[PDB]
Amino acid sequence: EIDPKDLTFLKELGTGQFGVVKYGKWRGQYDVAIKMIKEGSMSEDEFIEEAKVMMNLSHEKLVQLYGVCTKQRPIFIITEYMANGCLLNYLREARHAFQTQQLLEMCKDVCEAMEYLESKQFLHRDLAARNCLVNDQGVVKVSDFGLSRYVLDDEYTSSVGSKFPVRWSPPEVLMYSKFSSKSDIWAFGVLMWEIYSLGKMPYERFTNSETAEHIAQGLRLYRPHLASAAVYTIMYSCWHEKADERPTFKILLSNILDVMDEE
């Protein structure tokens, strides 16, 4: 519970699922992003109840929640500030002319954060390059982890919705609503593909529907040119048709370390 007096609003960063997000200073010194929650976009009381849990989630590679402001409307969510913004856009900028090592570097960051959530048995539910951020050092961090539970948009929270993360979702999710640490693993594999394909949309030639048939038939995403055999094998391991046969984030992290050492 941060006092709003300790906040100054400086510039606009954009708009997300809960509305406008601003850059500004906390306590006149610390860079912050401040979500201004559009009224009616969130289960606000539930989020407030469960926000205490999300504040204990502290990791070098998770976008840190600093505090909330809930004695006013709209409510605020104060978070760590990421200077280079959204990973997806960052990947799509060709001037960066990334080396494959820098790409694997970005995978190791996300995996490190997910490893920690997995230990805390805390599901993201929407892991994708659009939901990851890049700070002034090129470090990638996982953002908005766990906030899917409080969305009040039926285009997002329904399987048939226009905003549902279909292309990041394993078959068991899409057909049965079977959510587990394994559906975060699946999404993580898709995110590794994103990174090595340099921001291409997964199944770029298919609709969401064609994508769901495709993966129910045991068919998967092709190797991005910039992925070696070893890197491709890692993401594909995330996509086993049996959920319980997919690796942990612990195993994936050690997998990534190996290629780093090898290639």
Ligand SMILES: CN1CCN(c2ccc(Nc3cc(-c4cccc(N5CCc6cc(C(C)(C)C#N)cc(F)c6C5=O)c4CO)cn(C)c3=O)nc2)CC1
């Ligand atoms: C010209 N300018 C130059 C500068 N550019 C720039 C530079 C820096 C930044 N830095 C930052 C941008 C954002 C930011 C801004 C707008 C929207 C969102 N999103 C996207 C993901 C998301 C998912 C979900 C769900 C629920 C879907 C999940 N999971 C719910 C949500 F609320 C949101 C959300 O709010 C974010 C990220 O939270 C947050 N933080 C902390 C930054 O540091 N952003 C932009 C912008 C363009």
